[PDB]
Swiss-Prot record, chain B:
A GO CC term assigned to this protein in UniProt: cytosol
Assembly mode: Component of the large ribosomal subunit (LSU). Mature yeast ribosomes consist of a small (40S) and a large (60S) subunit. The 40S small subunit contains 1 molecule of ribosomal RNA (18S rRNA) and 33 different proteins (encoded by 57 genes). The large 60S subunit contains 3 rRNA molecules (25S, 5.8S and 5S rRNA) and 46 different proteins (encoded by 81 genes).
Subcellular location: Cytoplasm
Function: Component of the ribosome, a large ribonucleoprotein complex responsible for the synthesis of proteins in the cell. The small ribosomal subunit (SSU) binds messenger RNAs (mRNAs) and translates the encoded message by selecting cognate aminoacyl-transfer RNA (tRNA) molecules. The large subunit (LSU) contains the ribosomal catalytic site termed the peptidyl transferase center (PTC), which catalyzes the formation of peptide bonds, thereby polymerizing the amino acids delivered by tRNAs into a polypeptide chain.
Gene Ontology biological process terms in this record: cytoplasmic translation
Keyword Cytoplasm: yes
Superkingdom to which the source organism belongs: Eukaryota
Name recorded for this polypeptide: Large ribosomal subunit protein eL13A
MF-aspect GO terms: RNA binding; structural constituent of ribosome
Location (main, coarse): cytoplasm
From Swiss-Prot, chain C:
Residue span of region Disordered: 14-37
Record's protein name: Ribosome production factor 1
Pfam families in the cross-refs: Brix
Keyword Calcium recorded: no
UniProt-listed PANTHER family: RIBOSOME PRODUCTION FACTOR 1, U3 SMALL NUCLEOLAR RIBONUCLEOPROTEIN PROTEIN IMP4
RNA-binding: region residues: 227-244
InterPro entries: Brix, IMP4/RPF1
UniProt keyword list: Nucleus, Ribosome biogenesis, RNA-binding, rRNA processing, rRNA-binding
Example GO molecular function: rRNA primary transcript binding
The Brix domain, residue ranges: 72-249
Subcellular location: Nucleus, Nucleolus
Assembly and interaction partners: Part of a complex that includes BRX1, RPF1, RPF2 and SSF1 or SSF2.
GO CC terms, sorted: nucleolus; preribosome, large subunit precursor
Organism from which the protein derives: Saccharomyces cerevisiae (strain ATCC 204508 / S288c) (Baker's yeast)
Curated annotation (Swiss-Prot), chain D:
Domain comment, as recorded: The eukaryote-specific C-terminal extension harbors a nuclear import signal and delivers the ACL4-uL4/RPL4 complex to the pre-ribosome, triggering uL4 release from ACL4 and incorporation into the 60S ribosomal subunit.
Originating organism: Saccharomyces cerevisiae (strain ATCC 204508 / S288c)
The protein's name: Large ribosomal subunit protein uL4A
Assembly mode: Component of the large ribosomal subunit (LSU). Mature yeast ribosomes consist of a small (40S) and a large (60S) subunit. The 40S small subunit contains 1 molecule of ribosomal RNA (18S rRNA) and 33 different proteins (encoded by 57 genes). The large 60S subunit contains 3 rRNA molecules (25S, 5.8S and 5S rRNA) and 46 different proteins (encoded by 81 genes). uL4 is associated with the polypeptide exit tunnel. uL4 interacts with its chaperone ACL4 and the nuclear import receptor KAP104.
Span of the entire protein shown here: 53 to 259 of 362
Mutation effect (residue 43 to E): Leads to a slower growth at higher temperatures but allows RPL4 assembly into the 60S subunit
UniProtKB/Swiss-Prot annotation, chain F:
Protein name (record): Large ribosomal subunit protein uL24A
NCBIfam families, per the entry: rplX_A_E
Gene designation: RPL26A
Disulfide cysteine pairs (residue numbers): none
GO MF entries: RNA binding; structural constituent of ribosome
Length: 130, 108, 267, 207, 114, 125
RNA sequence: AAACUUUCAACAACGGAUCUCUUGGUUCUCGCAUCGAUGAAGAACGCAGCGAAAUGCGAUACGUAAUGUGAAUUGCAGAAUUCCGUGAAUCAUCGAAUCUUUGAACGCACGCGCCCCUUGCCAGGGGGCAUGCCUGUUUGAGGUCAUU
RNA sequence: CGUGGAGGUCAGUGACGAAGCCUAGACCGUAAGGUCGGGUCGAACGGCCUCUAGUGCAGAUCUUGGUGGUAGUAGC
RNA sequence: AUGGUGAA
RNA sequence: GUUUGACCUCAAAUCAGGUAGGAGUACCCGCUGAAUAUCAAUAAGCGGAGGAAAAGAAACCAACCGGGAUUGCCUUAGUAACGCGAGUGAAGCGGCAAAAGCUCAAAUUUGAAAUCUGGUACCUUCGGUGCCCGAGUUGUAAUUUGGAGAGGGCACUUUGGGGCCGUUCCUUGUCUAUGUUCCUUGGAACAGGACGUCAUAGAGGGUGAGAAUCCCGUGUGGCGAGGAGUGCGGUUCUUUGUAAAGUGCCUUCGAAGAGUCGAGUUGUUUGGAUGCAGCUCUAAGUGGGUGGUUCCAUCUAAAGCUAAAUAUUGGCGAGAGACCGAUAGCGAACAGUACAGUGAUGGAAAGAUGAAAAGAACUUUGAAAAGAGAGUGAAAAAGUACGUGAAAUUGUUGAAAGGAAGGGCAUUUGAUCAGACAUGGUGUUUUGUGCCCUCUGCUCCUUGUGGGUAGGGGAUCUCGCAU
């Protein structure tokens, strides 16, 4: 093409980019355990078999736990606001454990919380504080 | 007139793309678990084949939800109904095996 | 671009030639009125010829060469399996050498045997012509006592006057170098040493760089103190080779193809 | 190029001008005008039967026939006379087929692999290679086919430990796996009887 | 040879203008003769002008420091198509519902062996 | 054999690159091996040549001649050595063009950049 | 006979046919998306000491700004260099400037107007004033409703 | 029989001269052609089994390039 | 036939 | 009110913040479009985008024990179907490549338009905050998109943001082996032989002719410098707010794209009878669309977004060819240049000197062409008309022959070319030797009708050689 010949003749120079080799090489970037054990010399399927993992869940087309223990071991590696705490304390003082009476408190139960929610919050407060 | 000189090139590109996906998706197997399917067209009904995704009923019977199942690598298809007990049982067993074989890392 | 290069230089050469011609004409015209300036310019401009750029015992003569006290008998033969051309050249050898005896090659008498037989017969020198094709290519000369010998390559052999019976006069040129004068002495002792000037016969050897030209001419003088000459038949050029210094032992100057690169010293 | 030759405006003059009816470029002044165009016989014209890209390049071969050819090539290596007729200097091999210990596969340095090959008897073939290296004859000199040389010994291994890399640099020597056993390498030029060196582990795995 | 830019960086506007005027006068004087010094003075003039322009541009940037909608001259020259193609923040914008869904069921990392 | 997929062994491409290589690359191209005596001293095989570097002639008709270099003709890929000159018919003396690859450096010219390069290339001083 | 017509060996002219090669063309394969009012492609005029083509550049004009290399460039003259050094190359990278008149071409047109400002009635000096449409600010005019 | 290219083989040929060209030189064959003797030339080419094709010219009022009689003529 | 060129 | 305000509408400003043309065009999308069936939804023309575009998660395919986004390939298949004539020609299923689902309209946040654009001052600046201005109520946020979903109650489960270093990617510099040893030739050794060394480096190029070891380079690793990002592992500050979601159960409710579907007619496409398109009319909500023997099977159109496998003769950057070789290959290896045309357009010819110019110093004849000497140079049978120089054709020397010549059979004469460094073989007779006689040894296999190699003694000796 005309533009290609002009660029070749121009003294600006080509913006050379060499990345063919980088297409073959891909570094694992989603797990630290695999990276230490992964071997780039082998293929994806071979690497998965070496690690002890499945690279395909469906019957693959065409013909065909020393590391998983680390993954399993890797598996073994909220409170109440101050205003919420004060509101809970007020109701607890005014009604104690009388959940039914606490429900009908018009001027302390500003939000009509259910008996279950009130008792759960009070139990959480008691466990956290007493 | 198109000649598939790139056949080898296309295969190499597909392999490189799969390797890149594995590098990004190293922990996972690159595939979503698919259910067993019986085909229509009696000429092929004898053949059992993989489907798109498990039905909502199968996912419920497997002890997990579709929203949670998708995040674990289970294909969910809400369009397919269920009219065969054997296929439903096979899909449930496959899902149970998948759940018993999968390992999930903590989010912490 | 070929066209640009050809056109540019074509015009350049024309202008250069024009300038050279104009300068030469002006210089000649101005020198006509100033003759001394021409002499000064000629003195300041040397032609730098190849000749001008050259890059820098009585017992021996008697012992390794013939002398007038005894005429030298020269043994003439030919290499084995010789043919008509060799005998034709031997005819000229007889016509030019003083005392020659021709003997057919016996094909098996070693060089030592030939030398012994020649000593038995009191021969003085051995000359043998060698051929490869139907042409003479080389010539050799060996002296019997102490075995000083020389080997010469032959080229440009060409067959117009008829030489007389008189012995041609011997003249040598350009043998200043020590090696050259050895070949000059060989020629002076192999060719007749008794001039018979009457009959105006002359034989000349003329070396320029490495080749020696042998020719015969008749010379006649005129009142203008100049001598004219006419070709007396054969043309001959020779090239010295192998300078054995013995019958076949202890070569001293044998030429090598690797030489001649210097372009000078004219061995 | 398909567009080659078509990049010219020319039309036939028909008759009456007492000239060839081949179409000629119009216009004037340039000089190309009046010259033949579109003709295979014309200078700079459209070559007859241009080579198209959809010509057949690969040949389908039955898998069974391919295996038969590979088996025949492998068998041919067992005959010393057949291998000798192939041009390999196997006159000094201690045994045929040549069987070597598996430790050969573990060699990492070419200096040791070449010494082992020389000691076992392959020295003659290695000398034959690197000697017949001659410059390419014909126009191939400047098509990346500049140099050519005779094939060297073939090494067959069951597992790769470094021998494939150690032997790649020594000219003539080639390494292949028992599973592959390339026919193009076993019988280069369609000529059977290549000098092949096998490891005892590879010898067992051949069965 | 000639003036050095690293020396002219610290010169003031008035000093740079005086140097430029002197160099222009020298060039005008040399033009009458018609001589590599002409090239040196020409290069010095260009260097002084470039230094002055650089100082002026940084001053303009300083006066427009931090405030929105700076002059288009100082704006990025990347390309016409990159001023469009909504910036990173706009592209990353996500509805609250999608964020809630992602938080509730984030994509998990897992392997299938046991 | 070459294993990298980013490097091409094409004769045409290499020839084009060599002839069209810029002066910066030609500097690397015009390398000259060091003398065996100098190799032991600096522990380096070859270094780029420069003006003041002293070199020895190992090939060509001028074999055995030595002298201080005077110019590095990068455009012509040739270098000039002092006292190595031709004699024209008119008496004018023209330096003979020599290739650095056919010459051996006998005495290097030491500068700060050359000293840094020597250390960079594993040498010693 | 000489002269002259014709066949052939040698010598002396055309042309580059044969042989060798190429910073070329063509074809196959692979990575990526990269023009423009913050002024695209294209055209005209100028710039190197000497200049045909090509390339580069825009009155900062075969370049200016910045980093790497470390001692050049070269057809000729010319420069130097403190060259143990913030430093030369027509070197490489290239993110900072300049970027003549046209050209989507953009003040009005088929010559030629206005805001601005300035250093000295009047002028040098510096940037803009083209048409379609989106959001916001300013002004002006006109239909409904209110006006105890 | 011959040519462009490719796989194989001659541990082939070659600056002590490969290819091409010339040659009132010779040998071989019924021939496509091969080989050797001598001159210019300079750097690549060939003996043989296969594969491959833009593979072999006496003309197509055939294409490019080159040169003769016409003719030192018509004519200027 | 498609798209353009100049021409009263 | 013989007035003053709310808006709505319409104009203007050298207003502030913005975008649009056009270029390129191989591929993509739409319109149009030739030379009643065929070239043909081609050629040409116009408009609109990107690295891909379009399409895309069914008013689907099927009548089966059913499959479940779109896209590309094989298969289906040259079959069904049609024009039954030449001919055109599908699609489901099946296998493969790659897989991801979502967002609005629809039912009250009304116990708080909770939403958003712009101006202003800061900071940690592809943005955040305090304030103001304006849009919004003729609806801006959250909650729901049929897989249902929403208000409540019962046992429970869960949770994010910003910096730092590493990690990965892009740009880019650098380190990382061995002869120039000897001999022959050559102008030059990069040619042959001998002696050597490295090889995860014998791919390639340059160096006075074919170079691993002369250089640049290549194999593998190390050391750096400048940018991207949160694909993630540590590191550090924060959360909070009676905040937002999920699981199972009980309870009360529970919306769905109209000048749209559809029929009629007229133009158009299909091998499909479908679809596209001017216009009269114009549909229903346990409703509507697609298919068959009483209807049974499957979805919910008249809104939109979405990477992947898919095309690619343009652009940038790379790896290669059983490709062509200056009359080939792109028209152009030194050109879209010279040149022709008022114009749209057409459009060429041309590569190589020599290692290097060492490009003929200098003398000499010519107004000028270039000659003769002279020299450089491996060569001038390489002199810038330069790597090599055949025919057609032209001039000279020589031979021959003479209103023609050309070829075949056989031969004379003239000229001229080849025409064995063949110099042997046999039996006999002296002399000196060894591998020959004898004595004494060493060494390789296997084992054998052998091979190789030594130290003492002679001419029983022709076993061979030389005389």
């Amino acid at each position: 093409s005309v533009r290609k010949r002009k660029m070749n003749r121009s003294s600006v120079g080509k913006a050379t980019r060499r990345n063919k080799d980088k297409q073959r090489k891909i570094n694992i970037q989603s797990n630290p355990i695999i990276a230490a054990n992964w071997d780039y010399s082998l293929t994806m399927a071979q690497n998965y078999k070496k690690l002890g993992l499945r690279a395909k869940l469906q019957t693959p087309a065409g013909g065909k736990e020393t590391e998983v223990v680390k993954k399993l071991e890797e598996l073994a590696s909220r409170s109440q606001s101050e205003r919420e705490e004060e509101w809970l304390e007020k109701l607890y003082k005014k009604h104690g454990d009388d959940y039914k009476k606490m429900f009908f408190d018009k001027k302390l139960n500003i939000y009509q919380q259910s008996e279950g929610d009130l008792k759960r919050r009070l139990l959480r407060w008691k466990k956290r504080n007493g | 007139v198109k000649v598939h000189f790139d056949q080898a090139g296309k295969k190499v590109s597909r392999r490189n793309a799969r390797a890149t996906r594995a590098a990004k998706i190293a922990p996972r197997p690159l595939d979503l678990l698919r259910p067993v399917v019986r085909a229509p067209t009696v000429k092929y009904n004898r053949k059992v084949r993989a489907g798109r995704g498990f039905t909502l009923a199968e996912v419920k019977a497997a002890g997990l939800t579709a929203a949670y199942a998708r995040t674990i690598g289970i294909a969910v298809d809400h369009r397919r109904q269920n009219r065969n007990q054997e296929i439903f049982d096979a899909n449930v067993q496959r899902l149970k095996e998948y759940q018993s074989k999968i390992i999930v890392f903590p989010r912490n | 671009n070929k066209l640009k290069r050809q056109e540019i230089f074509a015009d350049i050469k024309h202008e250069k030639n024009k300038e050279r011609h104009t300068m030469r004409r002006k210089r000649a015209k101005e020198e006509r009125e100033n003759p001394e300036l021409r002499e000064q310019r000629l003195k300041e401009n040397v032609t730098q010829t190849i000749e001008n750029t050259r890059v820098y015992e009585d017992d021996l003569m008697r012992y390794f060469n013939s002398n007038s006290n005894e005429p030298p008998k020269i043994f003439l033969t030919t290499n084995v399996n010789a043919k008509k051309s060799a005998y034709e050249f031997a005819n000229i050898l007889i016509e030019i050498l003083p005392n020659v005896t021709f003997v057919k090659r016996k094909f098996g008498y070693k060089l030592k045997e030939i030398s012994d037989i020649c000593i038995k017969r009191n021969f003085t020198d051995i000359v043998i012509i060698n051929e490869d094709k139907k042409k003479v290519t080389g010539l050799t000369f060996i002296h019997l006592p102490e075995g000083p010998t020389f080997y010469f390559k032959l080229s440009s052999f060409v067959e117009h006057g008829r030489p007389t019976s008189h012995i041609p006069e011997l003249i040598l040129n350009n043998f200043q170098t020590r090696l050259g004068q050895t070949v000059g002495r060989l020629f002076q002792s192999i060719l007749p040493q008794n001039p018979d000037i009457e009959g105006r016969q002359v034989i000349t050897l003329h070396n320029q760089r490495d080749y020696i030209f042998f020719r015969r001419h008749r010379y006649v003088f005129k009142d203008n103190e100049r001598v004219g000459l006419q070709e007396l038949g054969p043309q001959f050029t020779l090239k010295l080779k192998r300078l054995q210094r013995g019958i076949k032992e202890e070569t001293e100057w044998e030429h090598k193809p690797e030489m001649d690169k210097e372009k000078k010293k004219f061995y | 190029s398909e567009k080659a030759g078509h990049q010219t405006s020319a039309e036939s003059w028909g008759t009456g001008r007492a000239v060839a009816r081949i179409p000629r470029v119009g216009g004037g002044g340039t000089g190309r005008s009046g010259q033949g165009a579109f003709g295979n016989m014309c200078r700079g014209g459209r070559m007859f039967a241009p080579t198209k890209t959809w010509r057949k390049w690969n040949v389908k071969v039955n898998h069974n026939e391919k295996r038969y050819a590979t088996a025949s090539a492998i068998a041919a290596t067992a005959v010393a006379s057949l291998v000798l007729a192939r041009g390999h200097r196997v006159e000094k091999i201690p045994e045929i087929p040549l069987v070597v210990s598996t430790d050969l596969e573990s060699i990492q340095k070419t200096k040791e692999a070449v010494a082992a090959l020389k000691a076992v008897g392959a020295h003659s073939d290695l000398l034959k290679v690197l000697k017949s290296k001659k410059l390419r004859a014909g126009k191939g000199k400047y098509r990346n086919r500049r140099w050519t040389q005779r094939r060297g010994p073939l090494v067959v291994y069951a597992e790769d430990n470094g021998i494939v890399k150690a032997l790649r640099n020594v000219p003539g020597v080639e390494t292949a796996n028992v599973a592959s056993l390339n026919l193009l390498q076993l019988a280069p030029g369609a000529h059977l009887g290549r000098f092949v060196i096998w490891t005892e582990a590879a010898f067992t795995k051949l069965d | 040879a000639g003036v050095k830019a690293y020396e002219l960086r610290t010169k003031s506007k008035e000093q740079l203008a005086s140097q430029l005027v002197d160099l222009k006068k020298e060039l005008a004087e040399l033009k009458v003769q018609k001589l590599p010094k002409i090239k040196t003075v020409r290069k010095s003039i260009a260097c002084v002008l470039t230094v002055i322009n650089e100082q002026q541009r940084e001053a303009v940037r300083q006066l427009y420091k931090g405030k929105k909608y700076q002059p288009k001259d100082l704006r990025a020259k990347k390309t016409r198509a990159l001023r469009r193609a909504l910036t990173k923040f706009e592209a990353s914008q996500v509805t609250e519902k999608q964020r809630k869904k992602q938080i509730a069921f984030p994509q998990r990392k897992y392997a299938i062996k046991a | 054999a070459k294993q990298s997929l980013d490097v091409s062994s094409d004769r045409r491409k290499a020839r084009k690159a060599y002839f069209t290589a810029p002066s910066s690359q030609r500097r690397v191209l015009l390398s000259a091996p060091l003398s065996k005596e100098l190799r032991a001293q600096y522990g380096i095989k070859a270094l780029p040549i420069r003006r003041d570097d002293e070199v020895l002639v190992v090939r060509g008709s001028k074999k055995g001649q030595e002298g201080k270099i005077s110019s590095v003709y990068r455009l012509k890929f040739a270098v000039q050595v002092d006292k190595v000159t031709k004699e024209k018919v008119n008496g004018a003396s023209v330096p003979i063009n020599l290739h650095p690859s056919k010459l051996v450096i006998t005495k290097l010219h030491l500068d700060k950049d050359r000293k840094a390069l020597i250390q960079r290339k594993g040498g010693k001083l």
